[PDB]
Write a protein that binds this ligand. Structure first.
Ligand SMILES: Nc1nc2c(ncn2[C@@H]2O[C@H](COP(=O)(O)OP(=O)(O)O)[C@@H](O)[C@H]2O)c(=O)[nH]1
Ligand SMILES: [Mg+2]
Length: 173
């Protein structure tokens, strides 16, 4: 039952990058390889980060294009964003640039809680975005970057946990 340790988190990124697979890994701790791309759902997880309990309300977006809500709605409501691309899809990496610019336009500041996730780390030979390039993009935006694999449950908890940290330090203002 935490108090202002209740955080509305939004998972955003291009289709097919692993938003559902990542979110389901965090909530359910197993890999779903074929999650209905049309389903946009919110989840809740109560968990401890840095020794402090937190209520996390996580929206797994299906995109505004066909199936989901207009993004400005949940982008305004969101307390923190998990910005996902896939390391074997440069177009998905371009899409996170666009999403980042939109978030900071909606918040009217360049310092809102965001964590960058490059998913599908298990497909190293298929990489299209160098780790150094993705890292630079994160650094230039003052955010943490994780390479994750929803398939192998690598850096799933760690990415979401870091996002909670960013939201906390932000609202220490
Ligand atoms: N190899 C690999 N494939 C993944 C990973 N995460 C998701 N996928 C695959 O990527 C596709 C899209 O994943 P999904 O969770 O539906 O992505 P979403 O559209 O962003 O919600 C599916 O075919 C998944 O099996 C991963 O970590 N590694
Ligand atoms: Mg999905």
């Amino acid at each position: 039952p935490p108090p202002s340790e209740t955080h509305k988190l939004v998972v955003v990124g291009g289709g097919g990058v692993g938003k559902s697979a990542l979110t389901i890994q965090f909530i359910q701790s197993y890999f779903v390889s074929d999650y209905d791309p049309t389903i946009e759902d919110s989840y809740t997880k109560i968990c401890s980060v840095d020794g402090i309990p937190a209520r996390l309300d996580i929206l797994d977006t299906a995109g505004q294009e066909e199936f989901g809500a207009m993004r400005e709605q949940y982008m305004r409501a969101g307390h923190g964003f998990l910005l996902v691309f896939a390391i074997n899809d440069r177009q998905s990496f371009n899409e996170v640039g666009k999403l980042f610019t939109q978030i900071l336009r909606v918040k009217d500041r360049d310092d809102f809680p965001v964590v960058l996730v490059g998913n599908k780390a298990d497909l190293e030979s298929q990489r299209q975005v160098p780790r150094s390039e993705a890292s630079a993009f994160g650094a230039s935006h003052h955010v943490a970057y994780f390479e994750a694999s929803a398939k192998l449950r690598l850096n799933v908890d760690e990415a979401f946990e870091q996002l909670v940290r960013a939201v906390r330090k932000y609202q220490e203002q």
